[PDB]
Design an enzyme around this catalytic site. Structure first.
Site, PDB file in Angstrom:
ATOM      1  N   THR B  40     -21.604 -45.528   8.491  1.00  0.00           N
ATOM      2  CA  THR B  40     -20.505 -45.190   9.360  1.00  0.00           C
ATOM      3  C   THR B  40     -20.780 -43.818   9.987  1.00  0.00           C
ATOM      4  OG1 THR B  40     -19.356 -43.910   7.780  1.00  0.00           O
ATOM      5  CG2 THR B  40     -18.607 -46.307   7.959  1.00  0.00           C
ATOM      6  N   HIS B  45     -21.443 -38.589   2.548  1.00  0.00           N
ATOM      7  CA  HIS B  45     -20.656 -37.339   2.402  1.00  0.00           C
ATOM      8  C   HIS B  45     -20.126 -37.351   0.988  1.00  0.00           C
ATOM      9  CE1 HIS B  45     -16.891 -39.416   3.054  1.00  0.00           C
ATOM     10  NE2 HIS B  45     -17.405 -39.928   4.158  1.00  0.00           N
ATOM     11  N   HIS B  48     -18.502 -40.485  -1.048  1.00  0.00           N
ATOM     12  CA  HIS B  48     -19.407 -41.421  -1.641  1.00  0.00           C
ATOM     13  C   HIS B  48     -20.000 -41.034  -2.991  1.00  0.00           C
ATOM     14  CE1 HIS B  48     -19.802 -43.277   2.445  1.00  0.00           C
ATOM     15  NE2 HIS B  48     -20.003 -42.052   2.872  1.00  0.00           N
ATOM     16  N   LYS B  82      -8.449 -47.778   5.782  1.00  0.00           N
ATOM     17  CA  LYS B  82      -8.366 -47.319   7.164  1.00  0.00           C
ATOM     18  C   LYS B  82      -7.071 -47.854   7.756  1.00  0.00           C
ATOM     19  CE  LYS B  82     -13.250 -47.805   6.727  1.00  0.00           C
ATOM     20  NZ  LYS B  82     -14.523 -48.220   7.381  1.00  0.00           N
ATOM     21  N   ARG B  86     -11.362 -49.784  13.918  1.00  0.00           N
ATOM     22  CA  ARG B  86     -12.477 -48.887  14.223  1.00  0.00           C
ATOM     23  C   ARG B  86     -13.240 -49.477  15.407  1.00  0.00           C
ATOM     24  NH1 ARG B  86     -11.142 -45.319   9.318  1.00  0.00           N
ATOM     25  NH2 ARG B  86     -11.144 -43.582  10.724  1.00  0.00           N
ATOM     26  N   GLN B 173     -18.712 -59.277   2.568  1.00  0.00           N
ATOM     27  CA  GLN B 173     -18.823 -58.513   1.315  1.00  0.00           C
ATOM     28  C   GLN B 173     -18.807 -59.520   0.160  1.00  0.00           C
ATOM     29  OE1 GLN B 173     -16.721 -54.783   0.798  1.00  0.00           O
ATOM     30  NE2 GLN B 173     -17.186 -54.726  -1.356  1.00  0.00           N
ATOM     31  N   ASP B 194     -10.224 -48.653  -2.834  1.00  0.00           N
ATOM     32  CA  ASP B 194      -9.871 -49.511  -1.695  1.00  0.00           C
ATOM     33  C   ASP B 194     -10.672 -50.800  -1.602  1.00  0.00           C
ATOM     34  OD1 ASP B 194     -12.295 -48.438  -0.569  1.00  0.00           O
ATOM     35  OD2 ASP B 194     -11.247 -47.255   0.868  1.00  0.00           O
ATOM     36  N   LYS B 228      -5.756 -34.373   0.758  1.00  0.00           N
ATOM     37  CA  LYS B 228      -6.850 -35.348   0.640  1.00  0.00           C
ATOM     38  C   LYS B 228      -8.157 -34.734   0.182  1.00  0.00           C
ATOM     39  N   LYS B 231     -11.072 -32.935   2.407  1.00  0.00           N
ATOM     40  CA  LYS B 231     -10.503 -32.512   3.689  1.00  0.00           C
ATOM     41  C   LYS B 231     -10.485 -30.979   3.719  1.00  0.00           C
ATOM     42  N   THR B 232     -11.542 -30.461   4.303  1.00  0.00           N
ATOM     43  CA  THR B 232     -11.831 -29.041   4.503  1.00  0.00           C
ATOM     44  C   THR B 232     -11.452 -28.611   5.910  1.00  0.00           C
ATOM     45  OG1 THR B 232     -13.538 -29.430   2.886  1.00  0.00           O
ATOM     46  CG2 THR B 232     -13.847 -27.356   4.188  1.00  0.00           C
TER      47      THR B 232
HETATM   48  N1  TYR Z   1     -17.167 -52.136   2.307  1.00  0.00           N
HETATM   49  C1  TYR Z   1     -17.740 -50.970   1.626  1.00  0.00           C
HETATM   50  C2  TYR Z   1     -19.263 -51.036   1.697  1.00  0.00           C
HETATM   51  C3  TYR Z   1     -19.873 -52.329   1.239  1.00  0.00           C
HETATM   52  C4  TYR Z   1     -20.675 -53.123   2.043  1.00  0.00           C
HETATM   53  C5  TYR Z   1     -21.230 -54.317   1.589  1.00  0.00           C
HETATM   54  C6  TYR Z   1     -20.994 -54.717   0.281  1.00  0.00           C
HETATM   55  O1  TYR Z   1     -21.535 -55.877  -0.196  1.00  0.00           O
HETATM   56  C7  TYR Z   1     -20.208 -53.941  -0.554  1.00  0.00           C
HETATM   57  C8  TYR Z   1     -19.639 -52.767  -0.064  1.00  0.00           C
HETATM   58  C9  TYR Z   1     -17.238 -49.683   2.286  1.00  0.00           C
HETATM   59  O2  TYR Z   1     -16.701 -49.719   3.406  1.00  0.00           O
HETATM   60  O3  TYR Z   1     -17.432 -48.651   1.607  1.00  0.00           O
END
Ligand code: TYR
Ligand code: TYR
Lengths: 317, 317
Positions: B40, B45, B48, B82, B86, B173, B194, B228, B231-232
């Site tokens: 993304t 960052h 993660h 979100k 997006r 996913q 999430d 959050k 969030k700096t």
């Molecule tokens: N959906 C997750 C990333 C993800 C992608 C593929 C997957 O199989 C699993 C997780 C995210 O936005 O952080």
């Protein structure tokens, strides 16, 4: 104008996206229109004649008809007009049925005409090779879940249930219209009553991608008794003479109830208004003669099986 | 058992599909687990690190971690967590970001270990070449629209709006988990808070296709002030030393509020319980010394940038 007014008189217009807009265009240009047919069996049946004969009517009035065989969509299945989720047919099955369907479609259209010769197309050609990513992005980004959920076909099934597979069908049909619009100058999509949602989705995708095109739907054929047109004790009245013989086909039509005969004449035949009106007066004056009924039977059997086949059915009766 | 109890003590377990079932398996076998990371941006960052460090913890306890780079899914976008739809990034962009992300992921895992060496995978490999038809049939038939609509990620957005594109992400996913389960013996999927919906969708697809596997989610990092995490005033604290220098990275952590420091020690560091407990007593007794804060800063900066980088940050301060 007169084409559209004729279809109205006949009872072949359920809904139209913009009537004045479409009448204008029909009257001003040679319109490329299409109708989609999904292989759900190895033969079309009488449920499909409305859409087929309507296309023929469009072609006779100088427009160019595109008959679309649902080779791709037949692999997903359309929830439209179905109260229940359907079982997925196999690729080999569907592939096989597509070939047969293509053959029966061709019977009803003119391929010799210069200016407006028909075309038979298979959506497998463009849906087959499309990757999910391209599909989700290029088609999917244009639709909100909220637009799709409000569709009659989906609204009608959320409690009953519907998989994602069938929920997504409309996108594919949507895409067909777009592709045909771009590649063939297709400006009108026709379909049965239950196709409104799918047709309008194609317009939404066109609108959102191009920013023009119309949608027309045919009403479901009614019976005065309130039973389902084509629901025989025999089972389905096929267009394949090997599933439903010309004699059986002929008989089905000959047994039209007096209450329905005039509505069927208008819908399924190429008899003029004055011819159809004359039969109504004949129907009133001498209903035991069954002139409306024989005319329907001969008219429709010739269309579908030809004179020789009609000759046999007549002599067998 | 003790791994899982440790994660609990640390506050790294939000939800688990079946805790006793997973504790059993963890304790009885070398578990293959995975975590997914979507490009993304051109760098990961601090948002993660929870998922990355948790994987590392799993690996140290003898399990085999699979880091999944979202090359395919990054082309769709996950609505999860979100509030807004997006914009789609381009293939070239995403493709470029995937390569960078792959590099930073590798820093945190062991590839030399025999028995449990990590693997970095790209879902483009299996989603890239998949045709829409196969996808709608083979994955789509298993999900009802009603199951998908109830997902937090979708429930949370229907009024706000969500395209089909993002609505469908969960399937992809879902499919990742299935493919990894089949090809790599993957029995556990971990993710942030999430991701519950997406993880459970993968289990539903496995269940329905095989008729075993678990799902674990990490809680969102909290701040006592209710702001959050991450969030700096500066903007995002990246893991790329060229976007956020080691000095800046170090400073971020050194400025942890007394109220949060002990929760961050537990979450982001490999300090033992007795070490972390000792710092709590030190935090109580001499809070102006800022020993908890320096320990966090050094611990996390070394992980991410190394000792040399930490040395610089220290001398620059
Ligand atoms: N959906 C997750 C990333 C993800 C992608 C593929 C997957 O199989 C699993 C997780 C995210 O936005 O952080
Ligand atoms: N969905 C239509 C058939 C169809 C298929 C593809 C299309 O593009 C249009 C229509 C039906 O079930 O009758």
């Amino acid at each position: 104008m007169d084409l559209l007014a004729e279809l109205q008189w006949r009872g072949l217009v359920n809904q139209t996206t913009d009537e004045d807009g479409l009448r204008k265009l029909l009257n001003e240009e040679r319109v490329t229109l299409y109708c989609g047919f999904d292989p759900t069996a190895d033969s079309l049946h009488i449920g499909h004649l409305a859409g087929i004969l309507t296309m023929r009517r469009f072609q006779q009035a100088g427009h160019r008809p595109i008959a679309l065989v649902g080779g791709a969509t037949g692999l997903i299945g359309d929830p439209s007009g179905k109260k229940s989720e359907r079982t997925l047919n196999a690729k080999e099955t569907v592939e096989a049925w597509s070939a047969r369907i293509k053959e029966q479609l061709g019977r009803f259209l003119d391929f010799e005409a210069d200016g407006n010769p028909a075309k038979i197309k298979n959506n497998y050609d463009w849906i087959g090779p499309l990757d999910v990513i391209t599909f989700l992005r290029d088609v999917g980004k244009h639709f909100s879940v909220n637009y799709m959920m409000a569709k009659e076909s989906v609204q009608s099934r959320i409690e009953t249930g519907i998989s994602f597979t069938e929920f997504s069908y409309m996108m594919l049909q949507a895409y067909d219209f777009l592709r045909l619009y771009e590649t063939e100058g297709c400006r009108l999509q026709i379909g049965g009553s239950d196709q409104w949602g799918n047709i309008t989705a194609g317009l939404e995708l066109i609108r959102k991608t191009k920013g023009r095109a119309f949608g027309l739907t045919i009403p479901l054929v009614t019976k005065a008794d309130g039973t389902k047109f084509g629901k025989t004790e025999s089972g389905t009245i096929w267009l394949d003479k090997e599933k439903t013989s010309p004699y059986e086909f002929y008989q089905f039509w000959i047994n039209t109830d007096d209450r329905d005969v005039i509505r069927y004449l208008k819908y399924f035949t190429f008899l003029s208004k004055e011819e159809i009106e004359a039969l109504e007066q004949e129907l009133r004056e001498a209903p035991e003669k069954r002139a409306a009924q024989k005319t329907l039977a001969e008219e429709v059997t010739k269309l579908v099986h030809g004179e020789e086949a009609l000759r046999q059915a007549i002599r067998i009766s």
